[PDB]
């Protein structure tokens, strides 16, 4: 229920797993980002809420080597820092 236009690095990540748009819903971006993590196997195989992204485009986007899916605030914040909201 928010239309967003990803900035270039986030868009590159979405296009890496086949996104073809300029404008997305926030929900849509979240699903593509999860698809990116699964397609690239960035999750820890034993404790799959851990994402290690240090030598990956996702790490540049988040500015950190790793994060937990439990860090809701951190994940939302990083996404919003990389998009333009369509008011």
């Amino acid at each position: 229920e928010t239309l967003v236009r990803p900035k270039p690095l986030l868009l590159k990540l979405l296009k890496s797993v086949g996104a073809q748009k300029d404008t997305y819903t926030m929900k849509e971006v979240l699903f593509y980002l999860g698809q990116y993590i699964m397609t690239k196997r960035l999750y820890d195989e034993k404790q799959q809420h851990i994402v290690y992204c240090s030598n990956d485009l996702l790490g540049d986007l988040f500015g950190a080597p790793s994060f937990s899916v439990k860090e809701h605030r951190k994940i939302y914040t990083m996404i919003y820092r990389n998009l333009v909201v369509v008011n």
Binding site: L33, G34, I37, M38, Y43, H49
Partner: peptide, 10 residues
Amino acid sequence: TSFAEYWXXX
């Protein structure tokens, strides 16, 4: 519990 299940409480 898969990453997909963790992601789908984002």
